[PDB]
Structure 1
Amino acid sequence: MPLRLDIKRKLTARSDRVKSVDLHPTEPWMLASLYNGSVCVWNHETQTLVKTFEVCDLPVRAAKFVARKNWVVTGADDMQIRVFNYNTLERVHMFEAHSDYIRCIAVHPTQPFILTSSDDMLIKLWDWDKKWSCSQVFEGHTHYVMQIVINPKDNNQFASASLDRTIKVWQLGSSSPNFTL
């Protein structure tokens, strides 16, 4: 039976090409990463642009809120991950994560972990409590890893989608995928 969803437009933000969007859990904010290398925070209640981060001159393909730390984590085509405090607009940290474009960032919901996927065919786990050390590298995709998502029911598992035509499900703590779809 057709679900009668009342679809209302809350915000319309015209900008350059948006490559990632994220929603803040407590604040009425939308994060938008742009192809021009900027990251914008929109308030969807006031319909106003609240914050803008100029990351680099290159496309920012991934951006995520880390609400518990007051951070915005960005991954750009310059192979750099940049961490910004969204209150002070200060750059907290910056490091080279991958040898090619960063496609996706997944933030672990409870642990101090960020997963990053890249066109280098790798997925890397970063621990921010250990000075952003790479704790693990996941190898096994044969093409660009376009998106990664943590299992909301089992935060030790995540899935990856790749241009190799495969989906791999991985476990934190395993260098090999649990299975391939």
Structure 2
Amino acid sequence: IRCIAVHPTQPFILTSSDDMLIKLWDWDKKWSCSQVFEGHTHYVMQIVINPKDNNQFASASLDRTIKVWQLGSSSPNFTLEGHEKGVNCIDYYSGGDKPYL
């Protein structure tokens, strides 16, 4: 189990794991696996929540690609073909104003 990303506003714990799975679990439901997010191609190395929009989040894998997701996409909205290596990590841009990873 590589990474957890959390919704702060909303009572959540998001997890990515190497099983090529991202699961969402709900703590108020007392660790329900509320939803499973899948659209993998490899181990899930990292999850980061765009906390800015907690709600939307991005995922990094070393198969070099990034999926950004919408809740209504237990899959990303899309995948983009980032790395020429692998995408180890994904990070967000502190400001809400503009947006970088």
User: Which TM-score band applies after superposition, normalised by the shorter structure?
Assistant: 0.7 to 0.9
Matches within 5 A, 1:111-150: 111-150=10-49
> How many residues of Structure 1 are paired with residues of Structure 2 in the alignment?
80
Which has the bigger relative contact order, CA under 8 A and spacing at least 6? 2
TM-score using structure 2 length: 0.73
Aligned counterpart, 1:172: 71
The one-letter amino acid paired with 1:132 is W
Q: Which of 51, 55, 62 is the aligned partner of 1:163?
A: 62
Give distance in 2, aligned partners of 1:173 and 1:110.
19
The one-letter amino acid paired with 2:19 is D
Report % sequence identity: 100
Matches within 5 A, 1:94-109: 102-109=1-8
Which blocks of at least 5 consecutive residues in structure 1 are unaligned?
A: 1-101
TM-score using structure 1 length: 0.42
Matches within 5 A, 1:1-150: 102-150=1-49
Larger strand proportion of the pair: 1
* Aligned-residue offset at 1:119: 0.9
Which blocks of at least 5 consecutive residues in structure 2 are unaligned?
A: 81-101
Give distance in 2, aligned partners of 1:155 and 1:122.
19
Is the Cα contact below 8 Å between 2:59 and 2:68 reproduced in 1? yes
Q: What's the CA shift string for 1:131-178, capped at 9, x where partnerless?
A: 110111011111111111111321110000012211110122422210
Aligned counterpart, 1:81: none
What is the Cα-based RMSD across aligned positions, in Å? 1.2
**Structure number, greater radius of gyration:** 1
